[PDB]
Amino acid sequence: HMVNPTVFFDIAVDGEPLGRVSFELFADKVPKTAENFRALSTGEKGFGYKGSCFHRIIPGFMCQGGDFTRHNGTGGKSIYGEKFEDENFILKHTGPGILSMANAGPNTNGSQFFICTAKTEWLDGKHVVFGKVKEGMNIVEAMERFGSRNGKTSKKITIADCGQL
Numbered sequence: 001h002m003v004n005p006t007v008f009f010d011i012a013v014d015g016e017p018l019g020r021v022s023f024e025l026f027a028d029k030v031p032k033t034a035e036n037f038r039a040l041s042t043g044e045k046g047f048g049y050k051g052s053c054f055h056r057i058i059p060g061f062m063c064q065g066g067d068f069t070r071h072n073g074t075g076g077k078s079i080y081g082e083k084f085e086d087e088n089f090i091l092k093h094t095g096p097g098i099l100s101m102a103n104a105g106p107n108t109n110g111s112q113f114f115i116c117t118a119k120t121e122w123l124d125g126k127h128v129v130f131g132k133v134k135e136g137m138n139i140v141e142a143m144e145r146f147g148s149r150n151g152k153t154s155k156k157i158t159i160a161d162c163g164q165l
């Protein structure tokens, strides 16, 4: 029987450790999308999230990260190539803690993702939901205090380490 994978991020604020966020990846519903995020979290293909930052944090909305090639929301790449398709839209943006793919149009998933800090139901059917925060929502809430209305962060919020549990 297959078990959904768990990954973790160790978060830092201007280099100072803050805490750990862990995620369940819904490989039972979106295996291709879950596998991309899993592999980028372990770095096992030779690239991935370690060291990257959350470039946009809007309190009461979401935290966005995963751009390890341009560091500002314009880049990133998947383990399948620069982009891959929307796998399905079975899962919805139901509340805080949902983990979903960022994109720039249909079938443009890369490595960027966001963590909801509110219900974002208007994104249902256009961003692929593929996981949820398991432990550490308190750490996501602490990250949120470094965001702003326009999303610029007041301190640099990084993934100091990440991997699979």
Ligand SMILES: CC(C)[C@@H]1NC(=O)C(C)(C)/C=C/c2ccc3ccc(nc3c2)[C@@H](C)OC(=O)[C@@H]2CCCN(N2)C(=O)[C@H](C)NC1=O
Residues within 6 Å of the ligand: 056, 062, 064, 073, 074, 075, 101, 102, 103, 104, 112, 113, 114, 150, 151
């Ligand atoms: C994946 C990456 C390559 C894409 N980048 C772009 O398309 C380019 C590079 C053109 C920048 C877009 C951009 C910039 C600032 C900004 C500022 C504020 C907003 N949206 C913003 C969107 C605000 C309304 O919505 C968000 O914050 C949403 C939330 C869900 C994740 N999410 N953001 C995306 O998936 C956006 C839609 N896509 C990208 O970030």
